[PDB]
Structures are given as structure tokens and as C-alpha cells.
Amino acid sequence: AKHLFTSESVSEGHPDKIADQISDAVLDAILEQDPKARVACETYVKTGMVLVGGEITTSAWVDIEEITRNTVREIGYVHSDMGFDANSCAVLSAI
Amino acid sequence: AKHLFTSESVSEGHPDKIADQISDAVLDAILEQDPKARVACETYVKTGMVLVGGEITTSAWVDIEEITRNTVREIGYVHSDMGFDANSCAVLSAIGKQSPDIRADPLEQGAGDQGLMFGYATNETDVLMPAPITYAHRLVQRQAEVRKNGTLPWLRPDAKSQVTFQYDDGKIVGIDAVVLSTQHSEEIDQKSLQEAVMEEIIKPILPAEWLTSATKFFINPTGRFVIGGPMGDCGLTGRKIIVDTYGGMARHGGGAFSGKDPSKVDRSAAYAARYVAKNIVAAGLADRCEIQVSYAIGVAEPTSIMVETFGTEKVPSEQLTLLVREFFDLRPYGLIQMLDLLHPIYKETAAYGHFGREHFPWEKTDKAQLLRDAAGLK
Amino acid sequence: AKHLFTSESVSEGHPDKIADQISDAVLDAILEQDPKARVACETYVKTGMVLVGGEITTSAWVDIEEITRNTVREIGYVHSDMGFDANSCAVLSAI
Incomplete structure (x- = not known):
């Protein structure tokens, strides 16, 4: 009764x-x-x-x-070369 | 009658x-x-x-x-170390687009909105502009020119200038204070920045005879200026109207220019007012001329036209107001027709002032000769 | 030396x-x-x-x-028929 089962996961850097x-x-x-x-x-x-x-x-x-x-800085986004910078990103609050 | 007058300008990197x-x-x-x-x-x-x-x-x-x-990339914001990155910035659009509609006289269209517009022109300078604002624009324009061509690679887009001129009986006799705040990289030390900026920006621009020993130079008075641009301060459209037109030398109606099509009198009439003010001075009718045009929304003809010569007019003032109405069609569509404003030429006008640069339609003195003949000054 | 001078003002409801x-x-x-x-x-x-x-x-x-x-409610924008509602408008904070 062999059958393949697949599961996936994403890292903390995933959007x-x-x-x-x-x-x-x-x-x-x-x-x-x-x-x-x-x-x-x-x-x-x-x-x-x-x-x-x-x-x-x-x-x-x-x-x-x-x-x-x-939170973003701890993940490891520190400059724009990575595609996202924690220190220079807009943080809008609608709370 | 000595008195100090100050005007300031900001570079294209300013928020x-x-x-x-x-x-x-x-x-x-x-x-x-x-x-x-x-x-x-x-x-x-x-x-x-x-x-x-x-x-x-x-x-x-x-x-x-x-x-x-x-647009941001051309200014020179390419990575986050400068404080703003063109390739990795959020660009939200709230633009509400509509559909144009579809027989009366086109020149009889009423003004789309009310407002006040002021035009100014003086024979103080060659381009018929106040002197302090012209040299304030030169410093920031020189800073961008030096930064881009590679003369000083450590410069960064954001920069502000402020020049204090010392008048005497209405004539400039020197410069009393020069302020040039510029954004740089962390590579350059503070002492070497002041020497380079003074030699490469202030010296080539300002006349050497005005810069005496009593002139005070303030080049980055606070200290290091590494992170600037949008991160340093917020930026909104129309917050720099005074540095655009004339500095503090002339009154302003309060209507912003950037982002408005020529059909809106808040922009075209200000260009038109400058156009008639420049022609009056260019015709020799007055040394200084100030024009105010006021429109009411839904009304074609201006509600009021005022000409002020500050007692420097070669003809009676009430005669000048007749000449302005006779020659220049100041109806909202007449401004477009007499200036040919329906062209994509407004990207260049939002950097270092809308006035004083002769390659603009409203900076042409073509009706100056006609006005002089009409006034009978030969 | 007659000359017309014009000044304008806007109400507190102006945007x-x-x-x-x-x-x-x-x-x-x-x-x-x-x-x-x-x-x-x-x-x-x-x-x-x-x-x-x-x-x-x-x-x-x-x-x-x-x-x-x-602040908007005190001005007098209370329902959408006026074109703007204080109780049902998005208030984003970028402070």
C-alpha cells in the first residue's frame, strides 16, 4: 500500500x-x-x-x-540589497 | 539705507x-x-x-x-544607505481617473477654481528676476551638477542653500552670509567636506568681489549629514512654493504649481502674470512690476487686475492697467493660447524654480516692443 | 491711484x-x-x-x-452624503 505524501514549510524570512x-x-x-x-x-x-x-x-x-x-531586524533584513530593509521601510498603522 | 535680505533654495534631493x-x-x-x-x-x-x-x-x-x-532613480536614490531606495520603496496610487466628456466659444470657458496669482519682474538681474533667489538656485544646482558628473562622488542628493545679500540704496554691495547644507556619505570627514564644498561649489558660483572677509560661511553647521532625503523629513507637493517663484522678494498667491495641468488657473495664470510682468519691465515701462490676477470659479474674465510699479513707472499707473487689458488676454483659456502651455515641458520646471530660465514659454519677451510703442515711449 | 486688491479665505471644512x-x-x-x-x-x-x-x-x-x-466630527462631516464620514474613514498613522 505504498503512497507518497508531501508536506512543506517556510522559513521565518518568508513574506x-x-x-x-x-x-x-x-x-x-x-x-x-x-x-x-x-x-x-x-x-x-x-x-x-x-x-x-x-x-x-x-x-x-x-x-x-x-x-x-x-521584529523585521531580528529576522535579518538590514539593507535594501536583500530586497527589504527594516530601518528604511514604511510602517503604516491602521489599528 | 543698508539692509540685509536673505533667500534660500533646496536641491532636487529635498523631500x-x-x-x-x-x-x-x-x-x-x-x-x-x-x-x-x-x-x-x-x-x-x-x-x-x-x-x-x-x-x-x-x-x-x-x-x-x-x-x-x-524619477527617484534619476535623482540619485539607489540604495538604503542614503536613506531612500528607488527600487525598493512602496509606491501607493490613490489616483481617481475619470472619462473626458464632449460647442460654445472655447475662450469663454470660466475658471475651474478661484484663486490669487502674483507675477513679479525687476530689472535688477539680466533674466528680470530678484538677485537673491537666482544665486540661491545656482548653489543647489551646482551641487547637483558636481555630484552627478563625478567631481565629488561622495555628495548625496539632499542639499539646501541660503544666501544673505547686503543691499545699499537698492543695489547689492556684497554677500553677508552663505549657508550650504549638503548630504554626504560617511566616507568623507567633516573638515575635508567644508574645504571641498567651499572651493568647488561656492567659489565657482558667487562673484569673488562680493565674498569679502566679513562674509560668514556655514557649511554643514551641525555636523555629519549622511542619512537624509525622505527619511529625514516628510515631503508633500506644494510645500516649497516660495523657493520656486521668487523667494521672499515678491508676494505670492498661495497656489502650488507642481502636479497641476495648464487648464487650472492656479498654475497658468501665475505663469501668465509673470509673462505680463516681465514684458512690462522689458519694455522699459517700469523698473519693478507686480501683477495680481484674481479669478472666480465659473467666471471667464478676471475679477480684478492690479499693476504695481512701486513708484518706478515711466507712464501713469492707470494707463498701465489699460495696456494690460488691451494686449494680454487674461481669460483662463486665453492664457493657454497666448503661451502654448499644452506640452510636456513641466518635468524640468519643478527642480530649480519655474521662473528665470529663458527656455520657457512664459519667459519670452516678445510683446515688449508692442507695449513700448503703445505707451508712446518711442 | 485707484487699484483693486483681492484676498481670499477658506472655511474649516476645506480639505x-x-x-x-x-x-x-x-x-x-x-x-x-x-x-x-x-x-x-x-x-x-x-x-x-x-x-x-x-x-x-x-x-x-x-x-x-x-x-x-x-476633529473631523467637530467640523461636521458625519455621513457619506456630505462626501466624507468621520466615523467611517480610514485613519492611517505613519508617525
């Missing part, structure tokens, strides 16, 4: 995983201050911009741009 | 001038396909994004992202 | 004045908490979005979206 990490980095920052917060964060990542949006019900104050840039 | 060039690059692309288009483009430039917005009434197809990236 | 009021509303909110702050706010207003951007050097916490919506 669909950068958005996931940015969204959860925002979530973790909020949970440190207000554990009972309500967070629904959606992140859209383009060639040179990061759009962070969603609805938050909390009493916590977070700097979305600082969190986003630190 | 407020990047937006102006991007807006006019879009305008020129549209005018190549549909000359009769209606364009009102506004550009917002941030650290890593360019937002191009506005309302367009045309049948032309343009690629906003391609135009924007090419 | 170029909405951006000015939104920018200064942000400035006033920051100055209440940190008077010695450094604020350079630029606002771009489009058909259905408000883009608030600039660089701020402060220790104050402000809700840009709440300030922007309150």
Missing part, C-alpha cells in the same frame, strides 16, 4: 511568515501590559511597506513602528 | 522637491498622450513610501509606479 | 484646512502631556482616508485615530 511574526509581536507586547486585552491584528507586507491593522480593546500603550522594525 | 518632481513627472507623462487632460496630482513622500494621489480626467494610460521609481 | 486642524489637534494633544516635545506632523486627506505622518520626539502617548475622528 507570509513576516506578517505572522509582526502580528504576534504586537500581541505579545500588549499582553505584557494588559493580559485581559482583546487583540485582532492583521498585517499586510509589501515590497517596501508594512501595514499593521486591526481592532484592539485594551488600556495598554504600544509603539507599533518600533515593534515592527525590531 | 519637498521629490514630491514636486514626481507630481510633474506624472503630469508630463499624461500630457504626452492627452494634451487636453485635466490633472491635479498630489504626492506624499515618507521614509519608505511614496503616496501619489489626485483626480485625473483623461483617456491616457500611465504606469504611476514606473514613473515614480524612474 | 486643505481639515489637514491643518488635524495636524494641530495632534500637536495640542501632545503638548498637554509633554510641553517640551518635538512635533512635526504632516497630514494627507483623500476621498475616504486620512494619512497622519511625521516625526515625534516625546514621552507622551496619544491615540491618533481618536483625535483625528473627533
